[PDB]
């Protein structure tokens, strides 16, 4: 029933966990507790097999643990800065090589999978800091320049015309801009990891930088030069919608150091580089 | 099914491309690869005819390549400037001889066709620059003066009454103004090109300037003179809706120089005037 | 027009909200999805797989 399924959505009871059944004392040459991890399989033994359990009706649901839920929360992926210091023409516009690798929090979650396919919801939070007192009338322009399209080199470059590229104009005082993006890859899924190169020589590039080009996000303060200088910081937030992930992997155990690469750094005392806390000894809880 | 067609719109699978079928080795006196370009026709040979192909189910769609899509993106066509410098009465209003010829990006796309018929969506992005600090309360008036209607000559001209002409009043702080326009020509389609004159003498005008008169866009700062001077720049954006185009033509290969004319300039080294990049020789990729 | 009452919360951006928004790439058709082994639909799937405990993680 499309209506019964609706209720499960509102109550978040789409994926229920099984009940625990009453079990009894046993004496048998069938020993569930014994197995062989060498097989590479996980022993599927349940509590009813190792102790005498009572009957319990489970009410927990796995909804929130779904991939859609795990990767469906908007997190910051970039903090763009336009700081008017001493030259409006040079400082009133900028560009960013788009990627989901600069902020650790959302990066780590996506990287818990090898491949992921999803649509995106981008939400922007612009904030104008009044360095000299007033902010006047601030209007911003954000333009997506796909790889190949001309990148503006001045605040009045013809590229800002955006005759084809998508641009979003935001006016200070209006609500936060937001839009959706369809799955953008030329492949069937995004590579979270890529053990390959863009060539076969000692100078070929390695990693996702080869497969994850997303273009450039160009932005400028549309408003022409004003007496009082401002510093506009636009924070970009990303969220995955209609998600699918494949081949789960170990979580990032050390701090990230660069984009598109798994490189890391180690100190002379490695226990400081991982979340593992040194134990006094084997028997000290 | 008006509902099945709906799904195709949401998924953008209205225009699907054909599949590639498995082909086999051949020996025949029917030679598809041979033809005669002199005929003026393009050889309709497909991959299955020149190599042994496998069967492949195509999933690409031509939706985005439609004329509606190609010309249906809002681009800048004008940047109106009202700059209060030393005389509010003279500098608080202006006028523009409307045309889609001043900005190269959208102009080039329309000019890839000889004739085009479409409705228009105009969106305005006004931005008030605080030259002295404050911007007070800025209210703008944009009035469309069709050819023949009286053009205001002062900020208080009776024409601003707009008793018949359409006017749009925008208040700073409110969302960007926008409105639609129906196909405006006295002909069945707009001329992107016109090999004709408005007379038969050495002094008759040539080109689209003869057929594309669209009137004047007059604008003024409604707000009366304020202590602090501002500079209001209103950028006009245009988009075609419900579009039809006829007789495709070669894309503009050199920079535009003027409106309503195909005139161009050449330097002493023409390779610098076109996108063609000089090749070292015939065999250097 | 239809009279409306703007409710508290309007215009706000909650990182966990679930709204719809216009698509910046109209008419764009995503790459056909192909079968890839190993799809995960819920994290519980990963919680049910054994992994080693660094039980002897003394400083040395």
């Amino acid at each position: 029933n499309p209506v019964e399924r609706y209720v499960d959505e509102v109550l978040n009871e789409v994926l229920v966990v099984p009940n625990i059944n009453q079990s009894h004392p046993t004496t048998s040459n069938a020993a569930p507790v014994l197995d062989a991890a060498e097989t590479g399989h996980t022993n599927k033994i349940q509590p009813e097999d190792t102790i005498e359990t009572r009957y319990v009706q489970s009410s927990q649901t796995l909804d929130e643990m779904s991939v859609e839920s795990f990767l469906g929360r908007s997190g910051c992926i970039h903090e763009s800065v336009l700081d008017i210091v001493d030259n409006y023409n040079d400082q009133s516009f900028t560009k960013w090589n788009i990627n989901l690798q600069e902020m650790a929090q959302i990066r780590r979650k996506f990287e818990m999978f090898t491949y992921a396919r999803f649509d995106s919801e981008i939400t922007m939070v612009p904030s104008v800091a009044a360095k000299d007192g007033h902010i006047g009338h601030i209007v911003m322009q954000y333009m997506y320049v796909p790889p190949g399209a001309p990148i503006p080199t001045t605040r009045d470059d013809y590229a800002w015309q955006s005759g084809t590229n998508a641009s979003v104009f935001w006016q200070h005082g209006q609500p936060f801009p937001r839009f959706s993006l369809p799955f953008l890859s030329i492949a069937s899924a995004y590579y979270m990891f890529y053990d390959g190169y863009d060539g076969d020589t000692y100078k070929s590039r390695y990693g996702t930088v080869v497969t994850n080009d997303m273009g450039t996000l160009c932005s400028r303060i549309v408003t022409s030069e004003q007496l009082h200088k401002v510093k506009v910081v636009t924070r970009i937030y990303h969220k995955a919608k209609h998600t699918k992930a494949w081949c789960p992997r170990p979580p990032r155990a050390v701090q990230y150091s660069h984009t598109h690469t798994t490189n890391y750094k180690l100190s002379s005392e490695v226990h400081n580089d991982v979340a593992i806390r040194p134990r006094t000894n084997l028997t000290t809880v | 099914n008006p509902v099945e067609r709906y799904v195709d719109e949401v998924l953008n699978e209205v225009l699907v491309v054909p599949n590639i079928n498995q082909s086999h080795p051949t020996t025949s006196n029917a030679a598809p690869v041979l033809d005669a370009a002199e005929t003026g026709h393009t050889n309709k040979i497909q991959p299955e005819d020149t190599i042994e192909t496998r069967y492949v189910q195509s999933s690409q769609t031509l939706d985005e390549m439609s004329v509606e899509s190609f010309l249906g993106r809002s681009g800048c066509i004008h940047e109106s400037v009202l700059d209060i410098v030393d005389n509010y009465n003279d500098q608080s209003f202006t006028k523009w001889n409307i045309n889609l010829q001043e900005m190269a990006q959208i102009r080039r796309k329309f000019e890839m066709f000889t004739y085009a018929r479409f409705d228009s969506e105009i969106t305005m992005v006004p931005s008030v620059a605080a030259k002295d600090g404050h911007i007070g309360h800025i209210v703008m008036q944009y009035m469309y003066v069709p050819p023949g209607a009286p053009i205001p000559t002062t900020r208080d001209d009776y024409a601003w009454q707009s008793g018949t002409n359409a006017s749009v009043f925008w208040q700073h702080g409110q969302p960007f103004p926008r409105f639609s326009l129906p196909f405006l020509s006295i002909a069945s389609a707009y001329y992107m090109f016109y090999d004709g004159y408005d007379g038969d003498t050495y002094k008759s005008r040539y080109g689209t300037v003869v057929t594309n008169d669209m009137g004047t866009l007059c604008s003024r700062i409604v707000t009366s003179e304020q202590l602090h001077k501002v500079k209001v720049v209103t950028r006009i954006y245009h988009k075609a809706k419900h579009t039809k185009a006829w007789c495709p033509r070669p894309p503009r290969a050199v920079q535009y120089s003027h409106t309503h004319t195909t005139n161009y300039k050449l330097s002493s080294e023409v390779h610098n005037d076109v996108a063609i990049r000089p090749r070292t020789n015939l065999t250097t990729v | 027009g239809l009279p409306v009452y703007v409710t508290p919360g309007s215009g706000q951006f909650m990182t966990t909200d679930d709204m719809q928004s216009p698509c910046a790439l109209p008419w764009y058709h995503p790459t056909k999805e192909i079968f890839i082994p190993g799809e995960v639909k819920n994290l519980i799937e990963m919680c049910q797989v054994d992994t080693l405990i660094p039980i002897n993680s003394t400083q040395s």
Binding site: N1, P2, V3, E4, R5, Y6, E9, V14, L15, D63, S66, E68, S69, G72, D119, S120, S180, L181, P182, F183, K241, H242, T243 | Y6, E9, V10, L11, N12 | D18, M19, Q20, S21, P22, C23, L25, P26, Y28, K41
Partner: peptide, 29 residues
């Protein structure tokens, strides 16, 4: 663009924009 259900509990799954990318979070399983 509404997937109207009935039961009376009439569900109204509405898609405001004409792109699949535009809709909210997906359903589970």
């Amino acid at each position: 663009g509404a997937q109207v259900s009935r039961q009376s509990l009439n569900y109204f799954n509405i898609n405001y924009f004409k792109d699949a990318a535009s809709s909210g979070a997906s359903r589970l399983d």
